């Protein structure tokens, strides 16, 4: 998915 | 020079040694810390430079990938799965020094066995849990007894310190039987730093003091969700403290650039820049004499  | 030339160039190069007394006394200022932080690459691999069929659904985050290059493979331990993938690396760690350390992000459901495996075939005698209470990821290890794949894991012992917890873990795979060590520190929100240095740097002294019980000395397992934030400034704790004590000095900026090299991302925010030259000063002032 999104961390950054 | 491709533009990954020139990553690969300044990661191998840049450097900003500062004596003890330099860092505890008169640091760069935080707008300094910052810019110089910034000016590091990244060094991501992008899905596209990553030929491993199936590897995505190993991963947590799709944007954070492990350097082929350095990427821990695993052997065939697991008749159930047919490939070697997990996001993981092997880091360097004082000097140069090889597989010192495995960044890896934490342990899906679908990837205990994996971790487990990894442990196991590494000969790795001491996980780093790097988390903030808040649960999602999934416990790896057991409340007591748990089987995963053809792994083992018996709690052995478990104490509570104000900082972390420590768990000595027996992992068992056929006849044979190994120890783990496992501490789980728990007060550092992704994103962000914790409060003070003075856990932390309990923490670096609770790793130092910890035995050696491998047949081979294996490297340190260090992760946190993404393995690469929390868990580089870990990294980058330990070595900087290591350079501090063995040498006086310290170069922070090549500290990170070597991590760099080694996996992606590691050390993901200048207030984490800036955290890791508080936390150093503060190991500084704590050295003996």
Redesign the interface.
Same mark, same amino acid.
Not at chain 2, 60 to 64: E, M, N, P, T, V
């Given at each position: 998915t999104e961390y950054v | 020079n491709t533009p990954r030339e020139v990553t690969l160039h300044f990661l191998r190069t840049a450097g900003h040694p500062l004596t003890r007394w330099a860092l505890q006394r008169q640091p760069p200022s935080p707008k300094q810390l910052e810019e110089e932080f910034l000016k590091i690459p990244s060094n991501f691999v992008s899905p596209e430079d990553l030929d491993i069929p199936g590897h995505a659904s190993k991963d947590?985050?799709? #944007?954070?990938l492990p350097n082929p290059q350095s990427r821990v493979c695993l052997g065939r331990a697991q008749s159930q799965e047919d490939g070697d993938y997990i996001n993981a690396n092997y880091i360097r760690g004082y000097d140069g020094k090889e597989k010192v350390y495995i960044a890896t992000q934490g342990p899906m459901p679908n990837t205990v066995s994996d971790f487990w495996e990894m442990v196991w075939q590494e000969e790795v005698s001491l996980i780093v849990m790097l988390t903030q209470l808040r649960e999602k990821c999934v416990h790896y290890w057991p409340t007591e007894e748990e089987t995963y794949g053809p792994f083992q894991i018996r709690i052995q012992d478990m104490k509570e310190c104000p900082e972390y917890t420590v768990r000595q873990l027996t992992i068992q795979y056929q006849e044979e039987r190994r120890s783990v060590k496992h501490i789980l520190f728990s007060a550092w929100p #992704?994103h962000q730093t914790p409060e003070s240095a003075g856990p932390l740097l309990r923490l670096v002294a609770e790793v130092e003091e910890s035995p050696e019980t491998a047949a081979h000395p294996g490297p340190i397992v260090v992760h946190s969700?993404?393995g690469?934030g929390r868990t580089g400034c870990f990294i980058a704790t330990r070595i900087g403290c290591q350079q501090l004590k063995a040498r006086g000095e310290v170069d922070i900026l090549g500290i990170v650039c070597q991590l760099r090299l080694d996996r992606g991302g590691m050390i993901?925010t200048a207030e984490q820049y800036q955290f890791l030259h508080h936390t150093l000063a503060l190991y500084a002032g704590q050295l003996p004499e």
């Open positions: - | 947590r985050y799709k #944007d954070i #992704d969700s993404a690469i993901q």
